[PDB]
Write a protein that binds this ligand. Structure first.
Ligand SMILES: [Mg+2]
Length: 283
């Protein structure tokens, strides 16, 4: 396996930080002027994590179409993702409006609501069946239908209703709950297992809108999830699987949202996930 050889030699030479810095230098720099308008200050969780203008998701209701969310469209892989930040107390109705308008089937959440003793994300979905949430600014109702708590992740089914038109949709919420507070997982096994659960639900499939993926900033763990999914897709699709270059796929994704993969350890982990996922698939 070629990718496993490049991996092993980056490891023996301790080059991970230097490989990662070169990705940071080659990565696209596009304007984010809507993100930086003063009227959108409180729609952004981080001042240094903004969606590019050319790939930003626009809310359809008029007034302010801004949400911190980017469409990553992977042409050759035939896969699209919306990467977004963890919703803010003020942007939960926007978040669910985007899910509605983009005809998304799945939401992939890679963080806990509280990590390292701080709030990383608003509690933007209901925790009890009998206590639904209404988002008055975007006129949406959200109801917990069921949830399935496993050791490494939780799957929720939710009903999203457009109160304007009374249409209802089922949204699946895939919540990875065991990503360590510091660093990355020891073994890619549970992350891959989680990714395949998302795949098996249909949420990544072209009959639906793009999956919505977020962590706290929507670039670090979120980048890892999309990078691994797209790389494994490409390895299944291509005549030559060993022709799949993680670094070139990452740089392609970074044309659509800045900062994807935030650390050299997250880069190493992405390589790891793709390599081990290749065995379990293409073995
Ligand atoms: Mg109960």
């Amino acid at each position: 396996m070629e990718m496993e050889k490049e991996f092993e030699q980056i490891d023996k030479s301790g080059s991970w930080a230097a490989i990662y810095q070169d990705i940071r230098h080659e990565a696209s720099d596009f304007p984010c002027r809507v993100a930086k308008l003063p009227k959108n200050k409180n729609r952004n969780r981080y001042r240094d994590v903004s969606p590019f203008d050319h790939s930003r998701i626009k809310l359809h209701q008029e007034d302010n179409d801004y949400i911190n969310a980017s469409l990553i469209k992977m042409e050759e892989a035939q896969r699209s993702y919306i990467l977004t930040q963890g919703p803010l107390p003020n942007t939960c109705g926007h978040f669910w409006e985007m899910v509605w308008e983009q005809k998304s089937r799945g939401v992939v959440m890679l963080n806990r609501v509280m990590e390292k003793g701080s709030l990383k994300c608003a509690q933007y979905w209901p925790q009890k069946e009998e206590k639904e949430m209404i988002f008055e600014d975007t006129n949406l109702k959200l109801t917990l239908i069921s949830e399935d708590i496993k050791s490494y992740y939780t799957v929720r089914q939710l009903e999203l209703e457009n109160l304007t038109t009374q249409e209802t949709r089922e949204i699946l919420h895939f919540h990875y709950t065991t990503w360590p507070d510091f660093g990355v997982p020891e073994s890619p096994a549970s992350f891959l297992n989680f990714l395949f659960k998302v795949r098996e639900s249909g949420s990544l499939s072209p009959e639906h809108g793009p999956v919505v993926v977020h962590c706290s900033a929507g670039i670090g763990r979120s980048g890892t999830f999309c990078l691994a999914d797209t790389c494994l897709l490409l390895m299944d699709k291509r005549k030559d699987p060993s022709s799949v270059d993680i670094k070139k796929v990452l740089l392609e994704m970074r044309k659509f949202r800045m900062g994807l993969i935030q650390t050299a350890d997250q880069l190493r982990f992405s390589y790891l996930a793709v390599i081990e996922g290749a065995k379990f698939i293409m073995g």
